[PDB]
Design a binder for this molecule. Structure first.
Ligand SMILES: CCCCCCCC/C=C\CCCCCCCC(=O)O[C@@H](COC(=O)CCCCCCCCCCCCCCC)COP(=O)([O-])OCC[N+](C)(C)C
Ligand SMILES: O=S1(=O)NCN(C2CC2)c2ccc(F)cc21
Ligand SMILES: C=C(C)[C@H]1CN[C@H](C(=O)O)[C@H]1CC(=O)O
Lengths: 50, 51, 50
């Protein structure tokens, strides 16, 4: 906004409130919000399953 | 997917709408209204994976 | 190009050769090229499969 730069080549996501001020290019990478969580490490009991 | 591209609401070269449409598109996407419209039409009659 | 209509609200993909002559907006869907091939007719395991 204050013109201290000319590009912003970065992981700078295209949101609604950011393009009313800076004025983006056309995307170089597809994504979305997703959830990170630990991989389940234990195994099911299964005392049966004969 | 072989490549990655996307649709557009294409205006003539040098039009006063390619900015007014994308503020309207991103307003429909933050509100999730571009997903209520896709689940409406790409719904289908259902299809089994079966295993 | 010759200014006969304004919008192109249709599945008109954003490509390199089209961007030079018309102004697309930012995407409203996301695409890819993939093969539409036909599924096999299952296996149909019979009732006398033993
Ligand atoms: C190693 C174990 C040794 C044990 C003994 C073995 C002995 C011999 C046993 C079996 C021999 C059967 C002939 C071989 C058939 C070959 C395949 C076939 O054609 O299947 C056909 C079945 O149509 C039938 O013929 C069903 C007959 C079953 C046999 C009855 C058991 C014998 C009882 C035992 C005597 C005890 C009683 C004692 C006093 C009498 C159908 O063809 P398909 O392509 O396979 O399926 C497609 C059809 N579908 C999609 C509609 C399903
Ligand atoms: O044609 S684009 O504007 N630029 C290219 N890309 C990303 C590079 C994959 C994408 C990805 C998703 C889109 F919706 C549009 C585009
Ligand atoms: C890690 C940070 C602060 C960045 C990564 N890109 C997001 C962005 O483009 O704003 C930010 C937030 C996030 O990961 O949700």
């Amino acid at each position: 906004i204050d013109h201290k730069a000319d590009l912003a080549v970065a992981p700078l996501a295209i949101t609604y409130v950011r393009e009313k001020v800076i004025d983006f290019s056309k995307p170089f990478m597809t994504l979305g919000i997703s959830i990170l969580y630990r991989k389940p490490n234990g195994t099911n009991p299964g005392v049966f399953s004969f | 997917l072989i490549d990655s591209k996307g649709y557009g609401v294409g205006t003539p070269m040098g039009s006063p709408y390619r900015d007014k449409i994308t503020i309207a598109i991103l307003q429909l996407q933050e509100e999730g209204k571009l997903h209520m419209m896709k689940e409406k039409w790409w719904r289908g009659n259902g299809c089994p994976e079966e295993e």
